Amino acid sequence: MDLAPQMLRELQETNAALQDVRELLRQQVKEITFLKNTVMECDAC
Amino acid sequence: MDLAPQMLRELQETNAALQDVRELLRQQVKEITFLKNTVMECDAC
Amino acid sequence: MDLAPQMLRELQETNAALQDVRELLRQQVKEITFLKNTVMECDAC
Amino acid sequence: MDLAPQMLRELQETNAALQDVRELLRQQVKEITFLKNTVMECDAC
Amino acid sequence: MDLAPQMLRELQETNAALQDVRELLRQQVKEITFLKNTVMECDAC
Ligand SMILES: C=C1CC[C@H](O)C/C1=C/C=C1\CCC[C@]2(C)[C@@H]([C@H](C)CCCC(C)(C)O)CC[C@@H]12
Numbered sequence: 001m002d003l004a005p006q007m008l009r010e011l012q013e014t015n016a017a018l019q020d021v022r023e024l025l026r027q028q029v030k031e032i033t034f035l036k037n038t039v040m041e042c043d044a045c
Numbered sequence: 046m047d048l049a050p051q052m053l054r055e056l057q058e059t060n061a062a063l064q065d066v067r068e069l070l071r072q073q074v075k076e077i078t079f080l081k082n083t084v085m086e087c088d089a090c
Numbered sequence: 091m092d093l094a095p096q097m098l099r100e101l102q103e104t105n106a107a108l109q110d111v112r113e114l115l116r117q118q119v120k121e122i123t124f125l126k127n128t129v130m131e132c133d134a135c
Numbered sequence: 136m137d138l139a140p141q142m143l144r145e146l147q148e149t150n151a152a153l154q155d156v157r158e159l160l161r162q163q164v165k166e167i168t169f170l171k172n173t174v175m176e177c178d179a180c
Numbered sequence: 181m182d183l184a185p186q187m188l189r190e191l192q193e194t195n196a197a198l199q200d201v202r203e204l205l206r207q208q209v210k211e212i213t214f215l216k217n218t219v220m221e222c223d224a225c
C-alpha cells in the first residue's frame with residue numbers, strides 16, 4: 001500500500017487541531033488578564 | 046525495513062493526544078471564565 | 091544516509107513530550123477548578 | 136515529489152503555529168505570576 | 181533522498197519548541213498551585 005495520502009491527512013489534522021489550540025490559548029490569556037486587573041483594583045487589597 | 050507504517054502510527058498518536066489537549070483546554074477556559082466573573086462580583090472589591 | 095530512521099525517532103520524542111504535556115494540563119485543570127471552588131466559598135466575597 | 140512537498144508545507148505550518156503557542160504561553164505565565172504575587176501580598180488575607 | 185532533510189529539520193525545530201512548552205507548563209502549574217494555597221489560607225475568606 002501507499003500510506004503517503006493518509007500521512008498527509010494526519011498532518012493536516014494536526015494543523016487543524018493546532019489552530020484550535022492557538023485560538024483557545026489566545027482567548028484564555030485574555031480571561032486571565034481580565035482576572036488579574038480585577039484583582040488589582042479590588043479595594044479590599 | 047520501510048518505516049512508513051510506524052511513522053503513520055506516530056502521527057495518529059499525536060493527533061489523539063492533541064484531541065485530548067484541546068478538550069482539556071476547552072474545559073479549563075470555562076473554569077477560568079467562571080472564576081473571572083465570580084471575582085468581578087466579589088463584595089470586598 | 092537514510093534519514094527515515096531519524097525522522098521516526100523525532101516523531102517518537104515528540105509524542106513523549108506531548109504525553110507529558112497532556113498530563114500536566116490534566117493536573118492544572120484540577121488545580122484551577124479547586125481554586126475556583128475555594129473562591130466561590132470565600133466569605134469576603 | 137508526489138506528496139512530499141505538501142507534507143513539508145504542513146510541517147512548516149505546524150512549527151509556525153507552535154512558535155505562536157510558545158509566545159502565548161510565555162505571556163500567560165507572567166500574568167499568572169503577577170497574579171500570584173498580588174494575592175500573596177493582599178492585606179485582608 | 182526525498183525532501184527528507186527539510187522534513188527532518190522541521191521536526192527537530194518542533195521538538196525543541198515542544199520541550200520549551202513542557203517546561204513552561206511545569207512552571208505554570210507550580211505558580212497556580214501556590215496561588216491556590218494562598219487563597220485557602222486567606223483569613224478574609
Ligand atoms: C489567573 C487565574 C486564572 C487561572 C488559574 O485558575 C489561576 C487564576 C486565579 C485567580 C484567583 C485565584 C485565587 C486568588 C484571587 C487572586 C482572588 C483574591 C484572593 C481576592 C482577595 C480578597 C480579600 C480581599 C478579602 O482578601 C481574586 C481572583 C482569585
Ligand SMILES: C=C1CC[C@H](O)C/C1=C/C=C1\CCC[C@]2(C)[C@@H]([C@H](C)CCCC(C)(C)O)CC[C@@H]12
Pocket residue numbers: 014018021025056059063066067070101104108111115146149153156157159160191194197198201205
Ligand atoms: C501553551 C500551552 C500551555 C497551556 C494550555 O495547556 C495550552 C498549551 C498547549 C501546548 C500544546 C497543546 C497541543 C499542541 C501542541 C502545540 C504540540 C504539537 C502538536 C506538536 C506537533 C507535532 C508533530 C511533530 C508531529 O507535527 C506542542 C505543544 C502542544
